[PDB]
């Protein structure tokens with residue numbers, strides 16, 4: 303590579319991610335969600351092109367990452383919006399839903415409870431917006447990386463590049479924590495807690511697809 | 515909890531001590547093996563610091579959520595020194611093409627193999643492996659369960675495993691930047707393990723074939 307992305311400071315990485323953030327959009331229940339998600343996806347495509355390192359990949363690889371990540375990204379967005387609304391999911395400012403409404407749809411209450419659990423966890427952790435954008439990028443680059451067909455040298459160099467950008471996001475995350483005054487022990491602990499939640503996000507996403 | 519008061523070196527030794535033993539129609543063979551492994555897993559889980567401190571409901575929930583990921587990461591670890599092959603048992607080493615005998619298995623096999631090479635490329639150590647495996651047990655179920663105090667305890671043990679992981683890396687001579695990076699790479703692979711597990715279940719359902727139930731998990735816990 304000649305990647306401008308690998309040369310960014312932590313502060314530059316955050317600013318670029320903050321700049322790239324989509325707006326909050328306004329809203330059958332499946333109909334409402336589908337309408338919303340559809341409109342969100344257009345923003346997501348455009349947002350992904352602005353995640354440092356993403357455009358350095360081939361189109362096949364960009365699309366693979368997006369195909370693998372799109373629901374988790376929708377989901378983490380939802381969770382972040384819902385944080386200051388305990389017991390409720392803020393799909394849109396004009397569409398705030400409690401658990402019991404998840405019931406109207408087959409299999410959805412389970413996914414809703416999971417979404418709510420993730421929201422409280424973030425809430426208990428006092429997740430910051432700067433952390434959130436970092437996590438969302440991680441999901442984009444990480445979710446798909448392990449399932450490109452891994453022969454062609456090209457395909458091999460794409461994975462290394464992704465692993466490097468991710469190490470940059472890790473560093474970025476650590477820097478925010480350091481700047482926020484957290485000790486080293488606290489820094490490594492919070493980093494672990496954050497990344498471990500991504501595994502629950504993956505699960506929610508898979509369960510969702512299975513229900514579908 | 516005596517469990518939360520362990521040093522990093524004590525945590526590793528205790529995890530190393532607790533490690534289950536490694537021997538094997540193909541679905542029959544694998545099911546037979548996995549079933550026998552599960553009994554050992556229950557035993558091993560009781561020895562993961564913090565696990566017994568939980569109620570039976572919570573222990574069973576964690577196991578129900580984790581059992582396949584744990585079987586899978588064990589398989590991956592065994593297979594590391596056998597590139598292109600999965601070592602289900604010392605008498606049952608399988609290549610990609612044999613995954614094909616079962617509908618939908620070759621996909622999961624390719625994923626399993628990918629994970630194995632990644633570990634191989636990262637030079638994953640046994641001390642790291644046991645830490646990751648414990649993380650999977652405590653983490654996979656925690657988000658989907660008194661019940662409030664159970665989660666804090668689990669979060670505390672997990673912070674201990676994080677610390678333990680960092681300590682091994684420090685002792686191995688890695689810089690701070692390198693430490694935080696390797697920790698992240700390891701934990702990010704857990705997300706792929708979760709996915710493999712879910713995909714597996716999905717394919718299993720798509721192909722009856724009985725799976726371990728909550729009930730079955732609770733029977734064994736009680737024995």
Ligand SMILES: COc1ccc(N(CC(F)(F)F)S(=O)(=O)[C@@H]2C[C@@H]3O[C@H]2C(c2ccc(OCc4ccccc4)cc2)=C3c2ccc(O)cc2)cc1
Nearest residue numbers: 335336338339340376377380408409410413510511513514
């Ligand atoms: C399409 O894939 C789907 C895969 C899973 C599902 N689920 C519902 C269930 F199936 F599990 F019940 S779920 O996992 O619970 C998922 C959680 C939540 O409910 C789902 C739903 C949703 C619905 C339709 C959709 O259509 C997207 C789309 C775009 C373009 C064309 C057509 C459709 C995308 C998401 C939510 C959501 C919407 C916007 C957000 O910002 C965040 C969350 C639905 C379709």
Ligand SMILES: COc1ccc(N(CC(F)(F)F)S(=O)(=O)[C@@H]2C[C@@H]3O[C@H]2C(c2ccc(OCc4ccccc4)cc2)=C3c2ccc(O)cc2)cc1
Nearest residue numbers: 544545548549585589618619622714715717718724725726
């Ligand atoms: C049972 O759930 C299943 C969920 C997934 C599947 N797959 C096959 C496919 F369907 F995807 F093709 S897979 O993802 O490729 C999975 C990878 C690997 O091949 C499968 C198999 C296995 C088979 C039967 C079983 O029964 C467990 C059991 C125990 C006691 C009572 C009832 C059941 C558990 C695991 C492997 C394995 C076995 C022992 C290890 O130490 C490590 C890995 C099969 C059943």
